[PDB]
């Protein structure tokens with residue numbers, strides 16, 4: 001008993017964007033106070049914690065387009 | 078008993094956007110106070126915690142289009 | 155019993171972006187106060203912690219387009 | 232029982248971006264105060280900690296396009 | 309029982325970016341105060357810690373495009 | 386039982402960038418104060434620590450494009 | 463015609479206060495935003511204006527007793 | 540016509556205060572944002588203006604008692 | 617016509633205060649942002665202006681008692 | 694017509710304060726941002742202006758008692 | 771017409787203060803950013819201006835008592 | 848017409864202060880950034896200006912008591 005598997009999807013997709021003029025952006029975070037109290041921290045795995053943070057992010061990409069594609073083929077017996 | 082599987086979807090999709098003029102944006106966060114109290118933290122797996130945070134994010138992408146595509150083929154016996 | 159597996163997806167996708175003029179961006183974080191108290195920290199795995207941070211990030215890429223593609227083929231008996 | 236596996240995906244994708252004029256960017260972080268208290272730290276694995284930080288990052292790449300591609304083929308018996 | 313595995317993906321991808329004029333960037337971090345107290349630190353593995361830091365980074369690459377590609381073939385018996 | 390493995394991926398990818406004029410960049414870090422107190426430090430592995438640092442980095446590469454490629458073939462019995 | 467005026471009030475008053483233990487007071491103002499727009503301001507006299515203010519005052523005097531006494535004698539012809 | 544005026548008030552008043560223990564006071568102002576716009580300011584007299592202020596005052600006097608006494612005698616013809 | 621004026625008030629007042637223990641006071645102002653715009657300022661008299669200020673004052677006097685006394689005698693013809 | 698004026702007030706007042714132990718005071722101003730814009734400033738008199746200031750004052754006098762006394766005698770014809 | 775004026779007030783006042791132990795004071799100003807823009811400044815009188823200042827003052831006098839006394843006698847015809 | 852004026856106030860006042868132990872004082876100003884722009888400055892009188900200053904003052908006098916006394920006698924015809 002033979003098995004024949006042919007896997008070939010075809011992607012011609014396009015992600016584009018056109019913006020004429022981009023600017024004049026003002027980010028003015030006016031302070032703040034953060035206090036966090038903990039005592040015992042145990043992490044044992046893929047762990048992405050974040051504790052006690054006061055962050056400001058200005059993100060202005062001219063583009064910013066994002067394409068994510070995953071191809072998974074599993075042959076098991 | 079032979080089995081024949083042919084897998085080839087075809088994608089010609091497009092994601093686009095046009096914007097003439099983009100700007101004149103004002104983000105003014107006026108402070109704030111955050112207090113969090115905990116004592117024992119145990120994380121053991123894929124864990125994405127976040128505790129005690131005062132964050133401001135200004136995100137102004139000229140584009141920002143997003144395409145996500147996943148192809149999964151599972152052959153099991 | 156022979157098995158034949160042919161794996162060849164074809165990608166002609168494009169991610170593009172055009173922006174005429176990009177600028178005039180003002181990021182003015184106005185201070186802040188962060189206090190975090192912990193006593194015992196044990197991490198034993200892939201762990202990406204971050205504790206007690208006051209960070210400001212200005213990210214202005216002219217492009218910023220991102221393409222992520224993963225091909226995984228698993229043949230098991 | 233012979234097994235034949237042919238693996239050859241074809242990538243002609245392109246990531247591009249065109250920006251005419253990029254500049255006039257002002258990053259003015261206005262101070263801040265961070266205090267963090269801990270006593271016992273044990274890390275035994277791939278661990279990427281970061282504790283008690285006041286950082287400012289200005290990132291202005293003319294390009295900034297990013298392409299990530301992984302090909303994994305596993306043949307097990 | 310013979311096994312034949314042929315592995316040859318083909319990459320013609322391109323990552324490009326054009327920027328006419330890039331400049332006029334002002335980074336003015338206005339001070340700050342960081343205090344961190346810890347007593348016992350044990351790291352025994354691939355560990356990338358960072359403790360008690362006040363850093364400012366101005367990163368302005370004319371290009372900045374990044375391509376990451378990994379090919380892993382595992383044949384096990 | 387003979388096994389034949391042929392491994393030859395083909396890379397014609399290009400990473401490029403063109404920038405006309407790049408300059409007029411001002412980095413003015415305005416001081417700061419950092420104090421860190423620890424008593425016992427034991428590191429026994431590949432360890433990349435960094436403690437108590439006030440650093441300023443101005444990085445302005447005309448190019449800055451980065452390509453990373455890894456080919457790993459493992460034949461085990 | 464003679465006039466005789468004798469002015470001598472006598473004050474033996476006392477203002478006192480006894481407090482055993484005074485403390486454990488927490489003032490935590492959680493931010494706020496104030497905007498005031500005016501164009502023409504003319505003040506010509508004893509004037510005690512105050513415009514556009516975000517103030518926090520913690521006043522904890524151990525005593526705080528206040529005595530105000532005014533003696534005015536006017537002889538006119 | 541003779542006039543005789545005798546002016547001698549007598550003050551034996553006392554202002555006192557006792558406080559045993561005074562302390563454990565926490566003032567934590569959590570930021571804030573103030574913007575005030577004016578164009579023309581004319582002050583011509585005893586004038587005590589104050590415009591556009593974000594102030595925090597912690598006042599903890601052990602005593603704090605205040606006595607104000609004014610004696611005014613006016614003889615006019 | 618003779619006039620006789622005798623002016624001699626007598627002050628034996630006392631202002632006192634006793635405080636046993638005074639301390640353990642925490643003032644932590646958490647940042648803030650102040651912007652004030654004006655164009656024309658004319659002051660011509662005793663004028664005590666103050667414009668655009670972000671001030672923090674910690675005032676902890678062990679005493680702090682205040683006595684103000686004014687004696688004014690006016691003889692006019 | 695003779696005039697006799699005798700001016701001799703008598704002051705035996707006392708201002709005192711006792712404090713046993715004074716200390717353990719923490720002043721931690723956490724940054725801040727102040728911007729003030731003006732164009733024309735004319736002051737012609739006793740004028741005590743102050744513009745665009747970010748000041749922190751820690752005032753801890755062991756005593757701090759204040760006595761102000763003014764004696765004014767005006768004889769006019 | 772003779773005039774007799776006798777001016778001799780008598781001051782036996784005392785200002786005192788006793789403090790046992792004074793200390794353990796921490797002043798930690800955490801940075802800040804001040805920008806002030808003006809163009810034309812004309813001062814012609816007793817003028818005490820101050821523009822664009824970021825100052826920190828720690829004032830801890832063991833005493834600090836202050837006595838101000840003014841005697842003014844004006845005889846006019 | 849003779850005039851007799853006798854001026855002799857008597858001052859036996861005392862200003863004193865005792866402090867047992869004074870010390871353990873920490874002043875740690877954490878940086879800061881000040882920019883001031885002006886173009887035309889004309890001062891013609893007793894003028895005490897101060898422009899564009901980042902100063903830190905630690906003032907710890909063991910005494911610090913201050914007495915100010917002014918005697919002004921004006922005889923005019």
Ligand SMILES: O=C(O)CN(CCN(CC(=O)O)CC(=O)O)CC(=O)O
Nearest residue numbers: 014016017018090091092093094095
């Ligand atoms: O096919 C469409 O619907 C629109 N076309 C043309 C879009 N534009 C062309 C351009 O922007 O250069 C025509 C237009 O905007 O009128 C896109 C394509 O063929 O991929």
Ligand SMILES: O=C(O)CN(CCN(CC(=O)O)CC(=O)O)CC(=O)O
Nearest residue numbers: 014016018091168170172245247249
């Ligand atoms: O095919 C398309 O949809 C657009 N073309 C042409 C895009 N441009 C050409 C250029 O920018 O040099 C045409 C245009 O912008 O009108 C891209 C391609 O063939 O790869």
Ligand SMILES: O=C(O)CN(CCN(CC(=O)O)CC(=O)O)CC(=O)O
Nearest residue numbers: 168245247249322324326399401403
């Ligand atoms: O093929 C494309 O899509 C664009 N070409 C041409 C791009 N340029 C040529 C140049 O910059 O010298 C044409 C253009 O910018 O109009 C690149 C290539 O063939 O590798």
Ligand SMILES: O=C(O)CN(CCN(CC(=O)O)CC(=O)O)CC(=O)O
Nearest residue numbers: 474475476477478479480553555557
């Ligand atoms: O007269 C009164 O009413 C109270 N006395 C005495 C108050 N105290 C004396 C002290 O505190 O030393 C007595 C008490 O508190 O029982 C005050 C005075 O005579 O001036």
Ligand SMILES: O=C(O)CN(CCN(CC(=O)O)CC(=O)O)CC(=O)O
Nearest residue numbers: 476553555557630632634707709711
């Ligand atoms: O007269 C009073 O009311 C209190 N006395 C005495 C206050 N004390 C004396 C001291 O502190 O040395 C007595 C006490 O506190 O019990 C003050 C004075 O006569 O000037």
Ligand SMILES: O=C(O)CN(CCN(CC(=O)O)CC(=O)O)CC(=O)O
Nearest residue numbers: 630707709711784786788861863865
């Ligand atoms: O008269 C008073 O009220 C207190 N005395 C005495 C104060 N002290 C004396 C000293 O400190 O040496 C007495 C005391 O503290 O008990 C001061 C004076 O006569 O000038």
